[PDB]
């Protein structure tokens, strides 16, 4: 019932980057990972089904392509279990499709269990991630129990997501932001050129304020607001202008 999904963010971003363009259609394809005892759903990898012009469909799943890749992947040394479904559901908290279920459902047959991974490629963009995994049926449960034996199981039914990577990529990933020396001080020494404007900026910062302050005597253009804000930005560059010497 409380189940652990796991992603190598590669597969995540892969989905994403693939799902990011996925609109309109859900991006489809394998998901690579395993099951470690119960609860353990790992995804090392994933990949696109090549687009189905008909859209997302259970027929559109091609097991040649996987075999193709999986071979080349097995050739890569890349090998996993197909762990379920992942799609891009723009604007969708929703649920995917009874089809998409039936899609997974006829598929999760191929496993002990699988996933249908919701992604809203739209609302994933928040800077947090929108994402989900259905697999709708249970043993009993974490053992839920009744609706299967009493039949008629139709629900959202998420799984429970997680993922893991490493400090390894993390460092390199924090390495995003020769380089900086070429890239910084000294590349943005570009500062003195506009001093007249850097004056004038500040010089224009000037007038805005008595004006602003004046109102001190709700609704706004607040007497106190921009005043600081206005100048303060300049400062850092206004500051560092010195440094290179």
């Amino acid at each position: 019932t409380k189940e652990t999904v796991y992603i190598s963010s590669i597969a995540l971003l892969k989905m994403l980057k693939h799902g990011r363009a996925g609109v309109p259609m859900e991006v489809m394809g394998l998901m690579l990972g395993e099951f470690v005892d119960d609860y353990t759903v790992n995804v090392v990898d994933v990949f696109a089904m090549p687009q189905s012009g008909t859209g997302v469909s259970v027929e559109a799943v091609d097991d040649v392509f996987q075999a193709k890749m999986m071979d080349m992947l097995k050739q890569t040394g890349r090998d996993q279990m197909v762990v379920g479904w992942y799609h891009s559901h723009p604007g969708f908290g929703c649920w995917l499709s009874s089809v998409d279920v039936n899609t997974q459902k006829s598929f999760e047959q191929l496993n002990s269990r699988a996933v249908a991974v919701v992604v809203d490629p739209i609302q994933s963009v928040k800077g947090k991630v929108v994402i989900d995994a259905f697999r709708l049926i249970d043993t009993g449960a974490l053992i839920n129990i009744q609706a299967l034996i009493h039949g008629l199981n139709r629900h959202y039914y998420s799984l429970n997501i997680d993922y893991h990577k490493t400090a390894k990529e993390t460092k390199m990933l924090m390495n995003l932001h020769y380089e900086e020396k070429e890239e910084s001080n000294l590349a943005a020494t570009k500062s003195m050129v506009k001093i007249a404007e850097q004056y004038s900026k500040r010089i224009e910062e000037e007038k805005e304020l008595t004006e602003e302050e004046l109102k001190t005597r709700v609704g706004r253009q607040d007497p106190k607001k921009h005043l600081s804000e206005t100048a303060d930005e300049t400062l850092e560059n206004n500051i560092v202008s010195v440094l290179t010497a």
Binding site: T4, V36, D37, D38, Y39, T40, T166, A167
Partner: protein
Amino acid sequence: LLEGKKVMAPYLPGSRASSRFIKGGSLYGLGLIYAGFGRDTTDYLKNIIVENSGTSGDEDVDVLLHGASLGIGLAAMGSANIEVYEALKEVLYNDSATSGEAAALGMGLCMLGTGKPEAIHDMFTYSQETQHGNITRGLAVGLALINYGRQELADDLITKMLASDESLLRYGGAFTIALAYAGTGNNSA
């Protein structure tokens, strides 16, 4: 201290059960009364454990293993029995998220104390080594256990647990820090 075994008797293993886990239930359920006093039955059940230790990946068994793997260190707690550590250490290493979990506890329970750093290494190894959420998790708890009142001692593993990428080691680290420094406040801690 008598009845409870007979209480468990109908649900004891060999009395069968409806559920193997019900059947597993007595195992853990047993020591509840007998904690520290059930070592015999425990070790006895540990034999049943040791019996199914190197084998028997039936979830039903694994529970019958786990539920026993539960109640073992339960009574074995605070008593240093390598077998308890050991027999679990396989049941541990047997990698049943069901079973191996309890091992990560009872082994801690056995050596609960200053324990031994080797198990720590093992646990901490098994931590990083063994691939599971729970099985990996409960390790640090066992680490938390057998680091008890050691205080300054476990600081390494503490630091190690602290330095862990994984929550789990960090996680138990506090508990480790607790059982080390529990009671008297170590401010720095």
